[PDB]
Amino acid sequence: PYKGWKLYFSEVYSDSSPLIEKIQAFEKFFTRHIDLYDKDEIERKGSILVDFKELTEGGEVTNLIPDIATELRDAPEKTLACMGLAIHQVLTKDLERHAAELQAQTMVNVPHIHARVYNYEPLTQLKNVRANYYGKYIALRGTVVRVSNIKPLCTKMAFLCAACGEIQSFPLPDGKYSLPTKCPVPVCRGRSFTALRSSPLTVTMDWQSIKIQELMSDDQREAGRIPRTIECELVHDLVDSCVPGDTVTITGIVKVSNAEEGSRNKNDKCMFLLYIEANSISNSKYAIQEIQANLFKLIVNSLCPVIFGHELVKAGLALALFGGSQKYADDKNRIPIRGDPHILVVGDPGLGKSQMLQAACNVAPRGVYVCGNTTTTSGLTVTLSKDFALEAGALVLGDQGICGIDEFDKMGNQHQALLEAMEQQSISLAKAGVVCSLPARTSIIAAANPVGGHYNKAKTVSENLKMGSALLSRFDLVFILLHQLLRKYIGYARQYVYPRLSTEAARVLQDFYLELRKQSTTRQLESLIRLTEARARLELREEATKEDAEDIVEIMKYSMLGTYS
Template sequence: MNQLIYSTSFVESSPYVEKIKVFEQYFTSQIDLYDKDEIERKGSILVDYKDLLSNKLISNTMPDLAKDLKEMPEKILDCLGVAIHQVLTVDLERHAAELQGQEELPAGLRPIINIPHISARVYNYEPLTPLRSLRANLYGKFVTIRGTVVRVSNIKPLCSKLAFVCNSCGDTQSVTLPDGKYTIPTKCLKTECRGRSFTPNRSSPLTLTVDWQTIKVQELMSGDQRESGRIPRTIQCELTQDLVDSCVPGDMVTITGVIKVSNEEGNGRNKDKCMFLLYIQANSVSNSKGQKSKAASESEDQGPSVEFSIKDLYAIQEIQAQEDLFKLIVNSLCPAIYGHLLVKAGLALALFGGCQKYVDDKNRIPIRGDPHILIVGDPGLGKSQMLQAVCNVAPRGVYVCGNTTTTSGLTVSLSKDSGSGDYALEAGALVLGDQGI
């Protein structure tokens, strides 16, 4: 069983055995809340981080679970995977025994239970880490980031286990490839064979490949986090198995995963230096754009990107009680520019938008509800300042200068990856500003 998760043999005295038993009790108490067929089909299970920590059994037996998950996430995630695998195996054996009794089959027959590898997808993980805080000290740690997808690569097969055939005796052994890096076995497993030459067998049933995809996530900057003179930061994330195709360019996502490093492919003077690039090995992806997420579709807390405190709600209630509310909104927009109330009124209407008409009527053409505003005036009147003020106020806004952009730069452009040479779609301003300004 543990060979599905761990590459080493089972040790009864391992400290992770107790953790696996506790997780088994946790999943057993909640097994009726999960769709077991869906778990087997996707090869993953959704684990709510908040519910996991609030469980009495978990909090009493593993009070340092939050620290352990942050410091050694791969071990804890493997323990969760082994636990749910054991629970599903026992549950299927119990159902098979009941069915065997109902059908009056011979008692000596044992059903074949073959459950694939199951990954634990943790969502609702806290706290949220800003991209500017991702440094070398977070290597190997469990983090959560939120941003906009600006680049999505093609889906490729990634070999996680590769079978090698010994050239001396013909014995076959399977070698785990960490992070997909090609690794050759050092010696043959047979004691009487001293062969050190091996040939990879990619068609062997012991060879395991999974779907693999990379995305680039750009940080979301609110008004108090904007830094003048700096372009938004980005980080690359790797998606595997059921997480691939969970987002498209322009989607706002929350990604939970492990910080890892990869060798930077340089040329010239930098090719001999030990340079590494930080990336995130994604464990779960929550898409807040209304599409069904592959890893956190049951999470309703991840949807809105704007969270209001009690103080904010009281301020909104006080503003709502004003007599001339629209006048207050217009005068509050870009107060550094004096006057131009009609221009500010039009920008305020564009900021709030309208309602679509005839969306569900098949006999009529739908009418969009978001207006387009064209501002024309002499230089130096503050047109750009007012537009930037609207982008800063909007929860999702992108500001571009018209004389320096192209059609492909505004929509979607094809970019070539320097490492693999493949082409990928990179989102432009219109895609990044979707459902925003």
């Protein structure tokens, strides 16, 4: 009466077992809510997404499941199996009725349906995950760092008993081919089984291993605490649902990892080891109003409270933190060019250029700080690791954020891919026959030292700075030198306000550009717009006026004043 019983439970079917009660409970729940889901998509993908708020709705549809929360948290592998068998029974009953109606005017083979529950609460942070969570169902939310490749994984294996002819679906622990020790029927214990690898009970699915790092407060919770990470295993439809850098919410069971990695030294090898079996994954991709109502100078001076002077440098840093408009026409595939401006700090030692890059990475919600001596090509570009996987580098880790590069005059070919990232918002990969293009929508702020030390002489910027024109033409702002509340304000502005350029702001830029032409790169004008739009996002305004443009022009005037000397 239960077709597919062996697809979820390895036990022998018995109407006296306590499984029937929960199975019929979830079957009632699914029959009452059969119109809420797409049966075709459930059959094709082999899974079903159920809202946890629907199970805890309370009433009549959930009458036979009053303790769904406790049973799911403490016994997930049993509750999910019962739920999957119930939805499979509902689908096969509906399809058998349809097939009978078709025959009147009956072998329906419904495959395995993964019962996936999303939007689970309470949310459990990774730092509070200990060993006692083993066998429990919890939900986490974090940023993806590593995404491995898709690989086949044999979950179950079919075994035919030579005594009674019964075929069982024995699950494998970590994929280890083990032989059953007794026949599942309580009659004969033949203890001799033949493997049936072509049988439908032998379950083989796609498998992926992702790594999740906790959402760490870059200043509050950074008082000696390291960001904790954990491994998650996606299977079947959950495979290829997130890329490195996305913030995803993953609900699943906590299970023991047994490989074991390493080694060595000295020493990150751990025999003792944890991981998460992912059941569902969701990928997204007042004090503020007092601040909006001298806002520019207040945020500017509050970026680095330990750096004296550099008022224009802090002014460009705030503009880069908010950023312009990522004007990507998704309906026209019109590239957004770039809305993230770049900053160059040309200064002598002892000015605090490194401290400005630190504050750039600290106040930003996604900051990556890099020194310019211990440099590797894989430290900034994507890293290829084959047995292949692509590991995000500093130019990829800084996506939707700011990356700071100190002493880049000391970097060699490990730095030239940053030029391709500042312009294409992407990283080029070509190694070991693997060719790809990875995202890198980041804002690059950098600082360097002059050629002959103190350069208050008759030379200009392109001559005194240890840098060629291939990178000088890529910066929106060049400055020549010789916390949590503003963090929330910047994060809210990057998510809420999308700026535009008005006509009054353009007329000011037209007059300055025409007067600059009469004195006789194009990216200079692109900087005027990208910083003006950044000023509109700073003021939480959807449209930048002439006042914002004049301020951006004066900032660019200071950049062009230190230059062209």
